[PDB]
Amino acid sequence: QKAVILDEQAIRRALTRIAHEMIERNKCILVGIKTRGIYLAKRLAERIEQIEGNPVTVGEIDITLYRNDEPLVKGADIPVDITDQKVILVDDVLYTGRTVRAGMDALVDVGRPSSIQLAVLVDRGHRELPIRADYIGKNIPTSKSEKVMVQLDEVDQNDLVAIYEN
């Protein structure tokens, strides 16, 4: 048993809305966290380029969770200097915030960004840290037992966001 919250079209509209919001708020480098966060950052960069006309750099931080979910940073690949620049971390599902914390720490170690923002496709609540997203595709109230999973063509061969019961 699962419930589809966002289909492919809903994901597309959310990503397009986020791209527009980013453009409006910032007149920037996108850095994905988690496997799907990285694919989402690449989609957002493509949307921003199609809207604004100029290239958007995409980097990634490679992070893995472990059960205090202590996520470890394996490595980071950001192809340009982030010092004095605005970086927007891109996440698929904002939950406890522990992966985002790890990503922020990785960024402040590789450079001195002027600011770090956070864009997420879904925010399911239940933060365990004082972390909030600046851009959100869809807020989804969830119980602590439910799981939220994003499927993307690049990894799962389909685009969908679904909620599952314990």
Added chain:
Amino acid sequence: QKAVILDEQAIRRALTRIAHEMIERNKCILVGIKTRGIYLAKRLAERIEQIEGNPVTVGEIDITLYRNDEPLVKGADIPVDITDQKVILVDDVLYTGRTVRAGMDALVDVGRPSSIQLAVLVDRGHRELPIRADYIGKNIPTSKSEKVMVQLDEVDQNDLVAIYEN
């Protein structure tokens, strides 16, 4: 030229409201950051004990800012284990969020808290990180040039929160 936003009585009411909110949300260890954040944590612990009847532990993280304000952690003194516990960082004025980030990092290094919340006397906006407070005494919209300063009896011999122009 300065404008008083909160007088002693307003600070007292804010701290009392925050204590009540903490009690309601959490049925916990308070850790102050910044000189005034530490004094505020001690006041909150006293209010919670007077409301609930049980002692509240107070710790502190010693952090200093430097102009990417890179705040450095000099040391931390938390008198009890924070592993598997809820810790609430206490800050005087939430601004860029860079001091809070440093405090969270210090905490996850000394233990494995189940969660970290953030209580602030004032939130003046202008975050440079995806950080949000869970408890706020007063929100104060400010321009980027204005400064917000909290005075406490323990440090400044008077209780007041004031805004100053560039």
